[PDB]
Structure formats: C-alpha cells, structure tokens
Paper text:
Ets-2, like its closely related homologue Ets-1, is a member of the Ets family of DNA binding transcription factors. Ets proteins share an 85-amino acid winged helix-turn-helix DNA binding domain (the Ets domain) that recognizes the conserved core DNA sequence GGA(A/T) through direct polar contacts mediated by residues in the highly conserved recognition helix (α3). Several of the Ets family members such as Ets-1, Ets-2, Etv-4, Etv-5, and Etv-6 are subject to autoinhibition in which additional structural elements outside of the core Ets domain inhibit DNA binding.
The crystals belong to a primitive monoclinic crystal system, space group P 21, and diffracted to 2.5 Å resolution with 3 copies of Ets-2 and three 10-bp DNA duplexes in the asymmetric unit. An examination of the three Ets-2 molecules in the asymmetric unit reveals that, although they all share the same core Ets family fold and interact with double-stranded DNA in a similar manner, the autoinhibitory regions are significantly different, being well ordered in chain A but almost completely disordered in the other two chains (D and G). In chain A the entire autoinhibitory module can be seen to form a complete folded helical structure and associates with the core of the Ets domain via an extensive interface formed by H1 and the β1-β2 loop. The HI-1 helix, which was suggested to undergo a structural transition from ordered to disordered upon DNA binding, is well ordered and forms a helical secondary structure that packs against the C-terminal ends of helices H4 and HI-2, burying two predominant aromatic residues (Phe-331 and Tyr-334). For the remaining chains in the asymmetric unit (chain D and G) the entire autoinhibitory module was either completely or partially disordered and was not modeled in final structure. There are also a large number of side-chain residues that transition from being ordered in the autoinhibited form to being disordered in the other two chains; a significant proportion of these (Asp-387, Arg-401, Arg-406, Lys-436, and Arg-441) participate in intramolecular salt bridges in the autoinhibited form.
Residue numbers in the entry: 329 to 460
The structure:
Amino acid sequence: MSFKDYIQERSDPVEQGKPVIPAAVLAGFTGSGPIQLWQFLLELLSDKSCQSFISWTGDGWEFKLADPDEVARRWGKRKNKPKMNYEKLSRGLRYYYDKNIIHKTSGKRYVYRFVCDLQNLLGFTPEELHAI
DNA sequence: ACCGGAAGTG
DNA sequence: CACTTCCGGT
C-alpha cells in the first residue's frame, strides 16, 4: 500500500493551500513517530511556496537546498530547536548515508538525493509528482 | 561545504 | 533510535 493510497483515506487527500505530502501524515504512514528530517524535506519539496529555497532538480529524487539557512530555520521551528543551522541539519543528512535514506550528490553544492525507493513508498513516480 | 567521530538530549 | 551539538580534518 502506497502513500497515494493512504491519503485517499483522508477527507481531503490534498488540502487547498497545504503541501501534497505533510510530514505528520507521512510519519503516521511510516509509523516512525515524531517528524523526521527526511520527511520534513519531502513536505517542503511537495510545497509550491517553498520552491524558492528548496526544490527538485532534473533527474529522479535529487533535490537542492537553494537557501540552506531558510530550510534550517523551518527545521528548527518544526522541531522547537531555536539554534538550528545548516551545519547541524546537514550533519543529520550525513547520518542518512549509511542508512540509505538520502545520499550526497558528489560535486554539487547543497544537492542531495533520496535513495529510499520513493517510487514504491509514495506511489508517485518522479514525473507524476513533479507535475504538481 | 563537506566529512564522520564522539557524546549528549529525549 | 534520531537526531543535536561539537569537533578536527579534507
């Protein structure tokens, strides 16, 4: 059962102004518990009003933190960690490397790649998601 | 910027 | 476990 299948259970599978993949729902789906960093990044990447500071690149699930500081600010906010910065947030991303959640794109600045089979998990292909 | 150990929070 | 905080090194 994908996430796309999961959201059908909601009264509003996609609320008007809200993102397509809220981290809370995704946490509820995965059953992880509190919001995780890789889930928060998807929420922003599925939010049109966040395109400016974070956005998908061309191929697959590669994304770029255009403005790392604004991402780290919203991450601190969501986590109630006032002193959050990219230096610490990115250290959270490096812990995903050996866990195969996210990987660093070698050579590109602030560019990362989801590597946890998002096609199967979300139910959306890269192209289908990147339409919205 | 990016890395990954160490240790602390919860 | 999942970071958060800090660090010397690349």
